[PDB]
Write a protein that binds this ligand. Sequence first.
Ligand SMILES: [Ca+2]
Ligand SMILES: [Ca+2]
Ligand SMILES: [Ca+2]
Ligand SMILES: [Ca+2]
Ligand SMILES: [Cl-]
Lengths: 228, 64
Amino acid sequence: PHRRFEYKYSFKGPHLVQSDGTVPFWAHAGNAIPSSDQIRVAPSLKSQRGSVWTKTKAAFENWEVEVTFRVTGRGRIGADGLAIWYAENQGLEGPVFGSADLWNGVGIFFDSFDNDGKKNNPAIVIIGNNGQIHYDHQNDGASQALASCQRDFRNKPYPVRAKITYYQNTLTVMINNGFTPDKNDYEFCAKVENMIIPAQGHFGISAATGGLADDHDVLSFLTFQLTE
Amino acid sequence: MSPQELQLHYFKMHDYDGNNLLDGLELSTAITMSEDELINIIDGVLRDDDKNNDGYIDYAEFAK
Ligand SMILES: [Ca+2]
Ligand SMILES: [Ca+2]
Ligand SMILES: [Ca+2]
Ligand SMILES: [Ca+2]
Ligand SMILES: [Cl-]
């Protein structure tokens, strides 16, 4: 498949922000702080919420986002995690990893904290929604998950990379677990076949903390349109 | 230094990720005005000069 980089749905350093502190083509909200090399979407303070969302909708039949991040905290346990989004509406603020609930589209949730105590975190969960469902925070969305994997994405020596691919109606999540600086050491995490999602949508990324709090940094969000 | 080398030096000076391609975010910074006018300039450059439609302007595309 031919790849086309899409600058309007992307961000990265070393000049990530403009002189007025904004991220070109993206809105940010809550506790998210953009700087020239990264966005600290949610700092390691208590009860933080932050998000960054594209100003306009993308209209791509197939696409691929590469997100480079680091989730860092003092503990062997941290909270709450980070979310990557494709949705009809901008979910700038809300109780769902910093973004609005009741979204129409797909969230990919990198959930650090085991709210249900099943000893199955950190976890990566893919949750489709049609604008009506309330994210089940206290059970880590386990009943709402179309697919998921167990993957410790916290406190890694190099930035973690997630590659989220929507090709021919299948959504695939590949993860590079940050053990090396080789950008292409991706391993399979999860996939949903025959997934149908809005035709147009904003891309987004958000994070939150609670009583426990990690720093959630996103270094880059790079979007490609795929044709074939 | 020749003019062509001066042009190559500008290309490389805005290639922050060192991949020998200039994308739209790299192009944006070269324009050291509203986000809408910026989008129109960058889309313009891509429309006119990105001959293979990969979203990048390589050095050949940059030279003309
Ligand atoms: Ca959780
Ligand atoms: Ca759990
Ligand atoms: Ca480049
Ligand atoms: Ca090109
Ligand atoms: Cl930049």
